[PDB]
Design a protein around this ligand. Structure first.
Ligand SMILES: CN1CCN(Cc2ccc(C#Cc3ccc(-c4cc(C(=O)NO)cnc4-n4cnc5ccccc54)cc3)cn2)CC1
Ligand SMILES: [Zn+2]
Length: 299
């Protein structure tokens, strides 16, 4: 059977929040069967727990934020994309500040941290959500869609502001059956245009941002000394964010996601519409991994 997975050991990372600029201690702790991903704010009394669920999504302007009252956990998507990518179902994520550290701006360091701690397969079937019918949400020219597909596939098209590498747009499609999350997506870094960055910094935002954790483009030129990790790194990072945002469903998806100039807000609205449309999905387990439509790497 395709089993649930957690970490073999507790592992720690240190970093800075992209938006808050605050130093943060990150602890990933193994968790038992059917826990899901649960975040906790350890710098607070009492300690506040926030399950990584679509219903707990608050702000979506700068990154995906989880909320419980006045308590927030900011920028959960890169860490969640790394967990989705590796098939981590159960884990405690303990943070000493509101924001998850940005690391190098990609899911790469989180994927390596998880693999360094080692994966632990658990004696219970991993639950998947199968897309049975198409579900879509739109707002103006933005669109996010789930389409039935026997596996997991992500397509994304973005519009720039503008234009970058002779194009006003960038597109990429990743079918996770033939292409691995680790190889083709995990290393794609977050990005910002200098004109936007100057505005964000003037408003005390993007405080932890630097060329060490973000691609900076001054109009049409990448300013980072060593350039890009992928020719289409921008759209690959949007795919990385969509995977993380989609993981807030609480279980891995069997289906195809298509994003058209979609961000954190519309990604969460798509999840809310899918959850509400119970006839469009069903929970499925695979007692035989050999015939399952999604494959995870050996533990
Ligand atoms: C000449 N130097 C170059 C180095 N500078 C320092 C520097 C370097 C990088 C940054 C930065 C940044 C940054 C800000 C926001 C994002 C961002 C991340 C996510 C994200 O990854 N979510 O997962 C989503 N949206 C983002 N975003 C980018 N532009 C935006 C404009 C408006 C709103 C949000 C915006 C990414 C990088 C700031 N200062 C000083 C001048
Ligand atoms: Zn991102």
């Amino acid at each position: 059977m395709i089993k649930q997975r957690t970490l073999k050991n507790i592992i720690r990372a240190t970093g800075v929040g992209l938006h808050s600029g605050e130093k943060v201690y990150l602890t990933l702790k193994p968790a038992p069967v059917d826990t899901g991903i649960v975040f906790s704010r350890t710098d607070l009394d009492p300690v506040v727990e926030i399950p990584a669920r679509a219903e707990n999504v608050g702000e979506t302007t700068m990154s995906t934020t989880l909320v419980k009252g006045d308590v927030k956990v900011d920028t959960v998507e890169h860490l969640l994309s790394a967990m989705a990518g590796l098939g981590i179902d159960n884990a405690y994520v303990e943070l000493s500040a509101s924001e998850v550290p940005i690391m190098d701006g990609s899911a790469g360091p989180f994927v390596f941290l998880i693999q360094s701690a080692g994966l632990q397969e658990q004696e219970a079937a991993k639950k998947f959500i199968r897309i049975k019918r198409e579900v879509s949400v739109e707002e103006g020219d933005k669109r996010a869609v789930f389409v039935p597909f026997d596996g997991f596939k992500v397509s994304f098209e973005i519009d720039f502001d503008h234009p970058v590498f002779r194009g006003r747009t960038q597109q990429a499609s990743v079918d996770f059956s033939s292409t691995s999350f680790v190889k083709e997506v995990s290393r794609a870094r977050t990005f910002g245009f200098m004109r936007d960055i100057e505005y964000l910094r003037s408003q005390n935002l993007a405080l932890g941002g630097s060329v060490e954790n973000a691609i900076v483009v001054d109009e049409n030129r990448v300013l980072n000394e060593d350039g890009l990790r992928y020719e289409d790194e921008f759209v690959k990072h949007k795919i990385l964010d969509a995977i993380g945002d989609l993981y807030l469903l609480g279980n891995s998806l069997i289906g195809e996601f298509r994003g058209f100039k979609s961000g954190h807000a519309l990604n969460n609205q798509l999840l809310r519409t899918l959850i509400a449309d119970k006839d469009a999905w069903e929970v499925v387990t695979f007692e035989d991994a050999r015939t399952a439509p999604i494959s995870y790497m050996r533990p």
